Scaffold this active site. Structure first.
Site, PDB file in Angstrom:
ATOM      1  N   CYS E  54       0.839  -1.188   0.000  1.00 50.81           N
ATOM      2  CA  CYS E  54       0.000   0.000   0.000  1.00 50.81           C
ATOM      3  C   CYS E  54       0.880   1.245   0.000  1.00 50.81           C
ATOM      4  O   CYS E  54       2.107   1.168   0.087  1.00 50.81           O
ATOM      5  CB  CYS E  54      -0.950  -0.001   1.202  1.00 50.81           C
ATOM      6  SG  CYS E  54      -0.142  -0.156   2.807  1.00 50.81           S
ATOM      7  N   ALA E  57       2.764   1.473   3.229  1.00 47.77           N
ATOM      8  CA  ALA E  57       3.961   0.639   3.256  1.00 47.77           C
ATOM      9  C   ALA E  57       5.112   1.302   2.513  1.00 47.77           C
ATOM     10  O   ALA E  57       6.265   1.233   2.954  1.00 47.77           O
ATOM     11  CB  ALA E  57       3.657  -0.734   2.661  1.00 47.77           C
ATOM     12  N   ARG E  88      11.316  -4.336   7.950  1.00 47.16           N
ATOM     13  CA  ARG E  88      12.417  -4.053   7.043  1.00 47.16           C
ATOM     14  C   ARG E  88      13.716  -3.918   7.824  1.00 47.16           C
ATOM     15  O   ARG E  88      13.743  -3.344   8.916  1.00 47.16           O
ATOM     16  CB  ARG E  88      12.144  -2.777   6.248  1.00 47.16           C
ATOM     17  CG  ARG E  88      10.949  -2.886   5.317  1.00 47.16           C
ATOM     18  CD  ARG E  88      11.144  -2.072   4.053  1.00 47.16           C
ATOM     19  NE  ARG E  88      12.006  -0.917   4.267  1.00 47.16           N
ATOM     20  CZ  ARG E  88      12.720  -0.330   3.318  1.00 47.16           C
ATOM     21  NH1 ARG E  88      12.702  -0.766   2.069  1.00 47.16           N
ATOM     22  NH2 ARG E  88      13.470   0.724   3.628  1.00 47.16           N
ATOM     23  N   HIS E 187       5.893   6.176  -2.275  1.00 48.52           N
ATOM     24  CA  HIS E 187       7.193   6.811  -2.469  1.00 48.52           C
ATOM     25  C   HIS E 187       7.025   8.265  -2.888  1.00 48.52           C
ATOM     26  O   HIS E 187       7.709   9.156  -2.375  1.00 48.52           O
ATOM     27  CB  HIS E 187       8.000   6.059  -3.527  1.00 48.52           C
ATOM     28  CG  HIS E 187       8.311   4.641  -3.169  1.00 48.52           C
ATOM     29  ND1 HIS E 187       8.680   3.706  -4.110  1.00 48.52           N
ATOM     30  CD2 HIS E 187       8.317   4.000  -1.978  1.00 48.52           C
ATOM     31  CE1 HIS E 187       8.895   2.547  -3.515  1.00 48.52           C
ATOM     32  NE2 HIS E 187       8.682   2.699  -2.220  1.00 48.52           N
TER      33      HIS E 187
END
Ligand code: FE
Lengths: 124, 522, 407, 522, 472
Positions: E54, E57, E88, E187
């Site tokens: 998503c 994320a 991560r 991003h």
């Protein structure tokens, strides 16, 4: 004479059965047994006589339960057991040693059997 | 001083300032201890290679052995039969030590008797001791069988067990029909596994040697399983479970898993389960006999092949993946029962766990020790896992076993840096792990001291210990684990990978120093 | 002190267990060789919790197993050359050892091995004290003979090593603790109280003991003997030879500890008695709090014990201090299921081998030989641990779950 | 720099001098980091009681929660049925996170699909998304039944699952008879266990609500078992084993133990085992329904008691000794089957292990966290072991559950120093274990960061973590363990006592400092 | 694999899809301008087991999370922040809970009351409590989850007001999961937040002493230490890495980024917008560098040194000479056991094309690749760097990818955790190309040794040769 005494000492705590036996052979005090003896006077008189002749100034008691009688040619000789009381092993007199049962290996069968009977009477 | 709210045991009560000062005064005033710099220098010397050459030149001194005496294994074998009392003809201190050892390992009551052989028996033998001991043991504990072994003193003085037992039966001390199998177990020959072999061979002889004229191989359509010296309760159960799943009739000879796992319900059971005398008497009628630990069941193998006329298969211990597969195939071939889907699913799950944990298990260096069959099975499993066994030590191994293990190692790319040591004790392994440091050791509780020594050199030189073997004293209920079959393979794999993960977590728990690698997912 | 009946599940040890495992083993700076086959040393390795301070493998060797590992050839041809080679290898590999003691196992006395001659020769060659102990297991009926033989070895080899030495600075407050094997730190918990009284504990063996302390023992003013059974011989020998009075001390429980401290202080001047009273006053609130916390949950519970030689008769005081009922010279100072059912004991205290049997029978149990991997139990500091362990074992819910609810 | 003979991963490659110098330059030149004295002072402040008072005054901030959202539990419930696809109507990131979570815990492939609702669905709903997703899921993966849950987006925008599925079946996207149970799982209500409850209630309603006319209670002579949110395969297997041992016919509804333990044999199986649709359809015919975790199966209990007319017994989770006994007696009373001797022997063996390790477990202080039923079962077992659960934390617990746990604690002498916290996260537990230090803490992998924190204060303040719960990420194959029944009780007891023993061994491994207590036998 | 066979395989795998699903998926599978061949950055087909994430994320878990000195709030319900906690492996140096807050989960834990009545007052109280309990944080970021954008919550006003009141940088990132189709929009949103709230905080500040060798590492997230292994090589070259974000990144480094002379962009996909913005506004040139594999590392080092004076190039030559024997020994040891093996990859935005270097450096051949959320430019860059007659898949589904692998039958697969166990079951060796399978670093000369060791460990592990029961 007519009597024989097996001289032993057992520790009250550890139950260490040491035997005071002549260094010249035999297992009996004061003299050795007759050669032909095989398994077949008061005992206290015998004890006191042994104490006097061997200059034993210790506390020796008679194990009345241990009675044995062997036959020598022409005589039935009782042998008794004399236990040394106290807590410390006395220094052995001249010509005598304080052996253990496992130290009787190599000695004849008769005296080994005598020591085994003493051990069974006392510890066993 | 003690606080009633925070009462301290020896640790850390003796870490208090008053106790520290008292101990320092004791050391500096009367102990005449060597200077601490001198002790440090000597310890550093003991961790070098020169000390390793000096230590490996030993020929008369044994330091920290990894083996026991035969009567211990004989007692363990005797415990595996129904209502059978282990009876060690000899000194009573040996029996006390055997019972203490097995009590500390299994944390269960252990039954064993002695005739209390004493100086009188040292001069005249233990014939009277044998008679009295047999009579008292039968009258007191009411056993269905008395399995007789020997200590060192009885073997040294040369006590004939057969003649002694025959004389005891003839003189009425025990009934003439009462089963009294015997085995000569010299403590100066072999180790405890040899004692187990001797006891099992003696029992099998007693029950089958004189009644072989009416035995036909394959009559009862069952397979005899001889587990050998096994101290894992799960190993006895995994074999039975896998054989029951296969639909294979079996007779687990010397099965002590029941008497060593008695429930606590307010009642004490001296005897529980075990191999019945009928199973032993009907053993020659089996299709075949499979030895779970063939490298110490040699006399048993000779007796079974010679007397029972059984073609004993050449099977390794069912430890790991390949050897468990071979054991299952051989059982299927002997019995004619196909391998069920449940066992195939279990093998697939084991392979799945191997694939999951290969990223952490691969390339790890292990120094392992124990019994020959257990050590060789663990080596095979480690090779199957991609691990590198670097110090394979077996104090009670022989040259043929060493050659077999070398052949196993040469068949794998991961056995290149592997050396097999036989007749070497744990003090040799200390030097081995100091000079050629492995990632871990795998062995019994006696290795816990080696890990103490390495940590003394430094945290970077510490070699953690993984407790797989016998005896385990510093951990609880590890005797219920399994090492055989697929289930044992999964348990061993989980233990290894999780030990690696705890070591990694401990090494990366330093805040702002090594905690960048303190990953949540590993 | 008689033979044990053959064929019974007796737990009696051997002379080797009473000598190597009890008297000689706790000596830390010395190396003890279990001369004979491999089993005896392996079963006795790190068995008893005789605590010590030292670098194991360098200057202390208590938890290590040095053995000859006799094979068939060593039985047929003897193990004297093997013993000499082993002594040489011990000297080579462990240079910081302060002595070697060769404890004999059963085959040694049966194959005709002269370990005394080898010990003498190697001690003369290496200028080291090598003590040959003929502690063969078949000798005697229990570990008492092992105690006697080990005491004889101490007297004949280690005790008189400084008879002609007069360079030790002696004080009128010199005492030596004998027979305390530091099981869980008992000897330390006694020595802290003794030194807080103004006394100097010159020697403390064998628990956390060294050969130097054994050699310095004949230079003390009083011998405080904890275990009479194992060191009565050595105490009497020291009293007869060196004229050192010996007395028995009991530090189990606060009442016995206080009485023993006062009795010990009565053997010295008024300063030691004043310091003893000060120590008793200092430690009174701690054991008073321990009793106030643990006596309510332990009052009225009944006790039976069956231990080796000393603890059967000297542990009563701590049990009565907690409000708990307890139901040849050792006997001078029930005296051995249906009987257990009739009296219904709440606790039984014996060794490990009987521990699991009595656990199966359901009676709460306490290991009276190794303190059940706990301790110390002696002294004021140990009384708290003893009371805590009593409460932990007696009042544990596990003993109330033996019967299934559907039965 | 790397040596090809010994290649170093991140640890300890980044401990080399060049990397340390580079990181020091980075920190001292551009990070503008606070002075190390300031960092140390703030850390010391965070471990004090004043910081604990500030931390427990939190009303709007949650730091390190110990719970998840409902659709995760809904997916876990859906995975327990035969050839069933979990389908979460909403955004795809939620499904990706669910699959990643379950993949990291179980180390197994986890199947779950989404309709990938986007901004377009934010204004018009996900009706077209639901239709297309159902059609694609049925055409591609060929499931026997699709179990539909929701994400937070679909719940906020108000998507009617019933109407959407009815339109999908009516407009010709899936067959009208295709099983598509649905459940609303608002991620802002409750936790994952609530989602499991909602999903199970939806499936049971879909399969039984409209066909209750021909159902008679106790027709099939079986007992329904609802395990709830369970992440231990051994928990699923032990209940089936114990019920088969008693000879009790049972129907384990939502049994995912087969699809979460598929073997590795070169073939990928999307579906394996699970509860069949016939079992769910015949569920109202059972004698009774037993809820293994009743404190998060309240909606399921309401549906079963109201619709199926089953008198659901008031049973606690079968965790520990007493509660396992109560569960066994209740099952025996319902089914009429007496408890076999094997289960009695298992209980006796558990009691024996309890007695063997009671000296090491008594008086130990534990801070535990997890799900309500698991936490209360662990507390009951710890009280049975003589342990003191000083800090009991349950983020998803309620007031009634807290009252029940307090009643449990007040009934035992070892719950005197025990406090139950509901709605508190792991930062609260960090403050608690810093100000009131327990001996150990029991929980999932997320506690590994608390232990590190404690280790930063000092080795004497470190609280070791025992990984029992969900999710465990830093250890391998722990999801195969058991926590239910006698077997689970023995596993938990062994884990606890062995963890205590490793901690003691580590604390006493210092040569000539603390090794006097480094006992071989423990 | 013949090209016609690849087309036949694509047709056969799409045979089972519905007509709409088939017609959409046919544009995302191609055989090696992107639009002529492959269609990317489009909607994902419903109900097809997508591996895509998503926007939350891609924003919180990727760009903002690795920043250590900042506290990141998962504004919304608990699940989103719980599943992404420490997922991560973006390595960092700091005291967690005091001055670094990467592995800790901050959330508002939205309930029904917060959904019905909004969560702005709750957000303000949460910010106050964050400032009270974590005084050493250098900034707060509020990552929006799905409910935030649907309940009409204005987090920008709360962020502005509380930042003005506390003199703190509070960055509202509207990264609602439903926004967009994948993490690429996450991003973009995170980059916009960085530009609008953090990047310009030092535009009027001129107290930083700059040098002609100032570079900033952008888009390196320090997965297992990749950024450190790149930075050591960069600094040995004589360059000063002023800024390194997000991996092991600080807010001060983000603010100092506009003061550097060059922007070395590792991940083009996640940090291309910010690089273009910095080039347009501050006039800072940006170049892509690839440190995966020795050949790529050497080429990238030479290209970077070519942007500076002769001293930097001489130092680059010295660094290459110093590190030559180590990677040469690594190749000599591991290439024999890895030569000729075939690889397939399915990764996110950058790695599928970046990793092809070290595989060829080890003697391996890549026969198939794909992306989860890449754009047309990513595929345009990828086609040049891959071989001919290979298979490229965009947002591949579970079924598509399992059938693809069943047909090609490669020797190794590099993808995420969600397909790792599927391919482990199917019998094909698997390497987690996202988290390095809890290993690393893989970038640079030091990381190449670890990469080769891991490749040999997994590909040649005996566990893959025991998958068939010997009685079957
Ligand atoms: Fe798996």
């Amino acid at each position: 004479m007519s009597w024989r005494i097996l001289l032993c000492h057992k520790h009250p705590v550890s139950a260490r059965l040491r035997f005071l036996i002549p260094t010249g052979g035999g297992v009996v005090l004061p003299q050795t047994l007759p050669r032909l003896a095989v398994i077949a006077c008061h005992p206290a008189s015998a004890l006191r006589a042994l104490q006097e002749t061997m200059a034993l100034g210790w506390q020796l008691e008679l194990i009345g339960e241990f009675r044995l009688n062997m036959e020598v040619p022409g005589q039935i000789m009782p042998i008794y057991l004399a236990a040394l009381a106290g807590h410390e092993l006395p220094p052995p007199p001249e010509g005598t040693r304080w052996i253990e049962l496992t130290q009787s290996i190599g000695m004849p069968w008769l005296d080994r059997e005598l020591l085994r009977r003493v051990y069974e009477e006392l510890i066993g | 001083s003690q606080q009633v709210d925070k009462i301290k045991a020896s640790y850390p009560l003796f870490l208090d300032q008053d106790y520290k000062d008292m101990l320092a005064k004791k050391r500096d005033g009367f102990e005449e201890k060597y200077p601490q710099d001198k002790i440090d220098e000597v310890f550093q010397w003991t961790t070098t290679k020169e000390y390793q050459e000096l230590n490996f030149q030993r020929e008369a001194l044994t330091v920290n052995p990894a083996k026991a005496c035969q009567p211990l294994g004989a007692v363990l074998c005797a415990l595996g039969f129904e209502k059978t009392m282990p009876y060690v003809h000899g000194s009573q201190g040996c029996v006390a030590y055997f019972r203490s050892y097995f009590n500390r390992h299994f944390r269960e009551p252990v039954s064993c008797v002695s005739d209390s052989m004493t100086e009188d028996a040292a001069v005249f033998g233990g014939q009277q001791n044998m008679k009295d001991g047999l009579q008292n043991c039968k009258a007191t504990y009411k056993p269905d069988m008395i399995a007789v072994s020997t200590t060192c003193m009885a073997e040294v003085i040369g006590d004939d067990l057969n003649a002694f037992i025959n004389n005891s039966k003839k003189e009425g001390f025990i009934p003439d029909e009462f089963p009294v199998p015997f085995a000569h177990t010299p403590s100066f020959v072999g180790s405890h596994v040899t004692g187990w072999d001797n006891m099992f061979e003696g029992i099998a002889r007693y029950f089958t040697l004189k009644s072989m004229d009416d035995k036909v191989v394959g009559s009862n359509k069952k397979i005899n399983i001889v587990p050998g010296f096994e101290t894992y309760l799960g190993n006895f159960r995994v074999i039975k479970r896998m054989l029951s799943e296969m639909g294979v009739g079996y007779s687990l000879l010397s099965d002590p898993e029941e008497v060593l796992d008695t429930p606590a319900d307010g009642q004490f059971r001296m005897y529980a389960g075990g191999t019945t005398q009928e199973e032993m008497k009907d053993a020659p009628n089996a299709l075949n006999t499979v030895l779970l630990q063939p490298w110490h069941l040699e006399k048993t193998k000779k007796f079974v092949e010679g007397t029972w006329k059984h073609e004993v298969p050449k099977l390794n211990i069912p430890m790991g993946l390949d050897w468990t597969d071979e054991f299952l195939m051989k059982v299927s071939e002997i019995s004619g029962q196909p391998i069920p889907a449940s066992l195939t699913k279990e093998r697939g799950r084991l392979v799945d766990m191997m694939t999951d944990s290969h990223t952490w298990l691969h390339g790890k260096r292990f120094a392992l020790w124990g019994d020959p069959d257990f050590v060789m099975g663990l080596v095979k499993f480690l090779l199957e896992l991609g691990c590198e066994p670097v110090h394979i030590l077996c104090h009670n191994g022989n040259k043929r076993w060493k050659k077999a293990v070398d052949a196993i190692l040469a068949a794998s790319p991961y056995g290149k840096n592997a050396t097999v040591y036989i007749g070497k004790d744990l003090w040799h392994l200390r030097s081995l792990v100091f000079t050629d440091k492995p990632d871990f050791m795998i062995g019994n509780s006696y290795g816990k001291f080696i890990q103490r020594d390495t940590l003394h050199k430094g945290k970077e030189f510490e070699v953690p210990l993984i407790r797989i073997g016998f005896p385990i004293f510093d951990r609880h209920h590890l005797h219920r684990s399994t090492t055989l079959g697929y289930e044992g393979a999964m348990q061993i794999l989980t233990t290894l990978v999780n030990s690696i993960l705890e070591r990694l977590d401990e090494e990366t728990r330093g805040m702002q120093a090594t905690d960048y690698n303190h990953d949540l997912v590993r | 002190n008689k033979k044990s009946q053959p064929g019974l599940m007796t737990i009696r040890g051997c002379a080797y267990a009473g000598s190597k495992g009890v008297v000689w083993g706790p000596i830390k700076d010395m190396i003890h060789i279990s001369h004979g086959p491999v089993g005896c040393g392996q079963y006795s390795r790190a068995g008893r919790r005789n605590y010590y301070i030292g670098t194991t493998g360098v200057n202390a060797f208590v938890t290590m197993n040095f053995t000859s590992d006799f094979q068939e050839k060593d039985i047929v041809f003897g193990g004297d050359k093997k013993l000499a080679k082993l002594i040489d290898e011990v000297e080579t590999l462990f240079p910081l050892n302060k002595g070697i003691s060769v404890q004999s196992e059963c085959p040694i006395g049966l194959i005709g091995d002269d370990i005394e001659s080898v010990s003498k020769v190697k001690g003369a060659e290496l200028s080291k004290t090598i003590v040959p102990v003929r502690c063969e297991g078949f000798r005697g009926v229990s570990q008492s003979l092992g105690h006697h033989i080990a005491n004889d070895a101490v007297r004949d080899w280690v005790l008189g090593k400084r008879d002609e030495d007069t360079t030790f600075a002696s004080t009128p407050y010199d005492v030596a603790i004998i027979g305390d094997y530091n099981i869980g730190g008992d000897a330390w918990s006694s020595r802290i109280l003794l030194e807080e009284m103004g006394l100097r504990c010159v020697a403390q063996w064998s628990g956390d003991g060294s050969i130097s302390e054994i050699e310095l023992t004949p230079k003390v003013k009083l011998n405080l003997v904890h275990c009479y059974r194992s060191m009565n011989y050595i105490s009497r020998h020291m009293e007869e030879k060196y004229g050192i009075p010996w007395m028995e001390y009991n530090f189990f429980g606060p009442t016995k500890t206080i009485e023993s401290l006062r009795a010990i202080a009565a053997k010295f001047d008024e300063s030691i008695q004043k310091k003893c009273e000060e120590v008793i006053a200092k430690y009174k609130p701690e054991w008073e709090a321990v009793v106030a916390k643990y006596r309510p949950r332990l009052e009225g519970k009944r006790v039976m014990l069956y231990i080796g030689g000393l603890r059967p008769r000297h542990v009563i005081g701590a049990y009565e201090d907690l409000g708990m009922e307890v139901v040849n010279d050792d006997y001078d100072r029930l005296l051995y299921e249906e009987f257990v059912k009739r009296i219904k004991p709440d606790l039984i205290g014996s060794g490990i081998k009987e521990k699991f049997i009595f656990q199966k029978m359901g009676i709460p149990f306490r290991e009276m030989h190794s303190w059940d991997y706990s301790g110390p139990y002696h002294g004021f500091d140990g009384f708290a641990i003893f009371a805590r362990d009593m409460d932990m074992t007696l009042n544990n819910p596990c003993w109330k779950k033996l019967q299934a609810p559907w039965e």
